[PDB]
Subunit: 179 residues, 4 copies
């Protein structure tokens, strides 16, 4: 019986265990929590309401094929519809990303992505219901760097809807301060 749900990207070198029998795991292209995705939501509702899990962790990673492909203007087929949610996030932060050296943008979008997905997670009926009946539950947004094996917590962390707004809002403001 596990204490953590990890949501991670299907990309190659990213395994939740390796990275960090205690893990319940979902893996999809670019570690997405899409609001109407039955697959991910069912993982989340089973973990929260059934296995009484208390931590959900969304882990993106640098050099993500999903992120790269979402940014390439390319006719790949079905997957392009999956990644339109990433393109929507890109444009929601277009000013920010535009201001950046083109070869740095992927890494930034990976980071932004993680914050957006936590924000989505935090607004599911599953998570709000659970928070609202006093169930203890915390959400985390991490980015793991394949270049140097180092995790990089993103200080998106939420234990309530109010804290969700605050850390989401701050994480975006921190990312907009450009080195």
């Amino acid at each position: 019986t596990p204490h953590y749900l990890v949501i991670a990207c299907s990309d190659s070198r990213v395994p939740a265990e390796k990275l960090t029998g205690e893990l319940f795991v979902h893996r999809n292209v670019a570690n997405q929590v899409i609001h109407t995705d039955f697959n991910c939501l069912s993982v989340v509702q089973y973990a929260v309401d059934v296995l009484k899990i208390e931590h959900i962790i969304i882990c993106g990673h640098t050099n993500c094929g999903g992120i790269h492909a979402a940014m390439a203007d390319k006719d790949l087929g079905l997957i392009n519809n999956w990644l339109l949610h990433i393109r929507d996030i890109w444009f929601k932060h277009g000013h920010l990303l535009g201001k950046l050296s083109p070869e740095k943008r992927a890494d930034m979008l990976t980071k932004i992505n993680v914050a957006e997905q936590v924000y989505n997670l935090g607004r599911t009926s599953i998570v709000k219901s659970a928070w609202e009946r006093g169930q203890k539950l915390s959400l985390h947004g991490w980015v793991y760097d394949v270049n140097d094996g180092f995790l990089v917590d993103q200080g998106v962390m939420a234990t309530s809807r109010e804290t969700l707004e605050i850390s989401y809002r701050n994480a975006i403001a921190r990312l907009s301060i450009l080195d």
Copy 2:
């Protein structure tokens, strides 16, 4: 990467236990015909990453299977698991003539076979077989660390039918 592995979200089932792995994990290692998430994964691997093997790995003592068999109002996940209840019914006569102790194990294996059968019927895999692309599909069940069942193994629509029928027939012994 060279393999796409589709495995259960359940706790002890890491794809790696067996850098070349693209992974999807969902409750009860399902390929639902109309699941945009899993299908996306399948299309990207087959059409873009050029993966030549897709492996559906189930496991013994699986909470998805157990919950699918229990009458219980669990909420959303129940809807996800209705596809496994349909599979229980499809093989209801086989599973009936069996000790209530060991039904989960059987349905765990049958489930794997049915997901490969579904996988091999996606437009994605069919039309890649049809344009000469090399692509094989596998159905494993895992425990003591070992693989218990291979069963279904397909390289073409033709071999899909045969491996599926034969896999079910071996289980009905």
Copy 3:
């Protein structure tokens, strides 16, 4: 504020109103209730839990492009995945349908389809929850004949899970008695 939810096929001459401001309406290819379909389920959960609707009616129709296409062994693309649920139903009743003049099979599969979809509907958490807290709710399976404007109730009718099993089971037995 409507009293009926109708689920019908997107095919051309089939409009719920015309056929029979009181209707909430969902239309998809071959009038499907797929267990993991967020779109249809959301219609159903809003109707039942929010608008307090008391009748849900699934209407198929003869000469259905969806049904025909599901039976043709044909490379149409994405839609083929949608219609694999119809092909599954076909094979669940293969003995029955096989025993039939090939040009009658479409019409029979349309009928069978309606029963299967009601059975799916009747097993949603939404509908079982509602029945189980004593909410009044009835499910209907109809086939409308385009050839002669006549509806044709299929005597799938359920007001409870026990009645669901019985009418589903009977509707299939009636259809297996071949004229």
Copy 4:
């Protein structure tokens, strides 16, 4: 048939009010990028039935829009309507500078524009524009029986961008 119409499941919105119609209806007339149901409808119409027009029809005084704006624990449908809350936020500055009485109406129109914009970005429609197939997309809003807004109208990816920007700019007056 020659038109695919995508309209709201809500009560007074029959496609026919305006034999040539293929219809889809869902809460708040949405085209969600990853909605297998609506996308199937779109792919079948475009690739198989050869429909040359797709029309997204929204309506005034729409329960989907109202519920999306209300803070209310409605259950599953809330998840469906999160995509409209994202659209509220995307145009939050426009909708803020507006009387709380008339926000629903505005967001009803903006919603229509965003769904056409999504429709025009599906692989299905893009790749049919790219192989020379004639296909136009429309965004209507309906009430007294009349159509209130046309706004977005697209025949190519190029015309998609222009019609979408301009439609939003006309609404920000």
